[PDB]
Here is the input.
Amino acid sequence: GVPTYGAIILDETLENVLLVQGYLAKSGWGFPKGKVNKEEAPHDCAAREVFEETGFDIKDYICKDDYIELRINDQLARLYIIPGIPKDTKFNPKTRREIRNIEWFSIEKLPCHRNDMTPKSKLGLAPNKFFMAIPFIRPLRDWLSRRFG
Ligand SMILES: CC(=O)N1C=CCN(C(=O)c2ccc3c(c2)OCO3)CC1
Here is the structure.
């Protein structure tokens, strides 16, 4: 699939992250990100997608080496880590046809896996509104421990 780029924005305490809520197939909460355009550099795609989805421009804050990248079902998603953004920042998407809401979440309260349904002897995972964010949570926590401690 086409690579996606975006950001993990943290506040100044490093204990909250900014998530966005879309519609329909992207009806849950996830980090701001989207698909790279032809010939567009990863940092420019991350900034574009984040500004489209949040109205906040990360361009002056991106650090080249500071990101988490995952390959899920053979599609690569790279989120640049952007700490220290104040919680009173006014975030407003460009297109509310794509973004329902924008909120800060406590990192420690976010799930890092979905729950099974072993209580019901049924296979699979229970729905979770953080499903898009979840794969990045443990790597983020590990990354923050290594970088800040
Ligand atoms: C116009 C536009 O940019 N698109 C349309 C709908 C929104 N998209 C996202 O980039 C997107 C991905 C994952 C998400 C998310 C949003 O919000 C919660 O998790 C896909 C592309």
